[PDB]
Design a protein around this ligand. Sequence first.
Ligand SMILES: COc1cc(Cc2cnc(N)nc2N)cc(OC)c1OC
Ligand SMILES: [Ca+2]
Length: 164
Amino acid sequence: MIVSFMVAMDENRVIGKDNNLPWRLPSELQYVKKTTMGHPLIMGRKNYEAIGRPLPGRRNIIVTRNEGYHVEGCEVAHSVEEVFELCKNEEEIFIFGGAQIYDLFLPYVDKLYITKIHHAFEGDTFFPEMDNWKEVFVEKGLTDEKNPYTYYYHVYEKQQLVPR
Ligand SMILES: COc1cc(Cc2cnc(N)nc2N)cc(OC)c1OC
Ligand SMILES: [Ca+2]
């Protein structure tokens, strides 16, 4: 099962503030929605609560220590093992939100769906750093009136290597 990340980022690798996104990008969010369509959404509790509601078209799997955490139209996992368990028959998943959720799926990550907004915002949350990788795709995001920022979509798959 392909373990993919889906993050929208910043100049300073900002991916949030008190809980929500510092930017308002309906186009970006559409590219997000389309890309992950058909695949589960792996996201932490405070993250999903930022999102606000179950994103349709995909298994909404949530992560939390809380054994007694439930939320309608959503699956909940207390372990990475329990996510891999749930998504055992999945061809690909998308790690979505919570900087600490990334660090849990870090050891397994396969593909990186990183958006980079060319600005410096004020944010509390940030994205863990990484050493590789290998960019396979790149496209600029639509800067409109409703997308008042310049940002590009960046895809990264693991860098191979020629046997010594
Ligand atoms: C509904 O779509 C949302 C998705 C996300 C997570 C997320 C969304 N897109 C990308 N590219 N990376 C992410 N980590 C975060 C959100 O706010 C926290 C969303 O809306 C509220
Ligand atoms: Ca893997």
